[PDB]
Amino acid sequence: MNGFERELQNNILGLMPQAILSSEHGSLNPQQLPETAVKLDGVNRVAPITTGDVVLQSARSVAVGVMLGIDPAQKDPLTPYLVNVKQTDLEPGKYNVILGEQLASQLGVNRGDQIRVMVGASQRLFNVIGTFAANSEVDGYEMLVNIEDASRLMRYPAGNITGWRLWLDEPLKVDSLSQQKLPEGSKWQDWRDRKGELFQAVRMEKNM
């Protein structure tokens, strides 16, 4: 089923980081490995990101999220799905957050509320300013924050980021693409880290 493949690509992989070029050791310093030095095969776009799993606590519930720390001035695949909120309200040092609609619902929060956002011992209160609604599973776990705020929560050195998010011409070929020559001291990680079972299903449907 190219049906299965098309759906996987458009409805899930289109709305999450397909791959990230990060540092071998710690966070990435974009002055040491700048965006212009990211020249990879099969990659059609590069953007900065700070990201990781976060534990979330509202007044009513708890959840695991995927924090997407973004430059609010760049269009994200989720930007067209924002509900009545401007991405540019994610100003650095405001600690605002835009939650997936379903994540927000499960936490029982509305805009104007705060939520506690935790990465191990590092914790910060973020201010819910809105939601996105893509009618995708990402609605249940992704959240958008300002990249600098996310880097602070992650305890990165000032100006550092997780790495360079990549968009791929053919995201189903991440196994081959991950073997290519990378900048020194960098490494490749991709969407298989989170959706491994769907990757295995793609392989299963092919071989039949």
UniProtKB/Swiss-Prot annotation:
Ubl conjugation recorded as keyword: no
Keyword match Mitochondrion: no
Subcellular location: Cell inner membrane
Coiled-coil spans in chain: none
Principal cellular location given in the protein's record: membrane
GO terms, biological process: lipoprotein localization to outer membrane; lipoprotein transport; protein localization to outer membrane
UniProt keyword terms in alphabetical order: Cell inner membrane, Cell membrane, Membrane, Transmembrane, Transmembrane helix, Transport
GO cellular component, one term: ATP-binding cassette (ABC) transporter complex
Membrane topology: Multi-pass membrane protein
Molecular function per GO: lipoprotein releasing activity
Family recorded in the similarity comment: Belongs to the ABC-4 integral membrane protein family. LolC/E subfamily.
Role played: Part of an ATP-dependent transport system LolCDE responsible for the release of lipoproteins targeted to the outer membrane from the inner membrane. Such a release is dependent of the sorting-signal (absence of an Asp at position 2 of the mature lipoprotein) and of LolA.
Official protein name in the record: Lipoprotein-releasing system transmembrane protein LolC
Residues of the full protein shown: 48 to 266 of 399
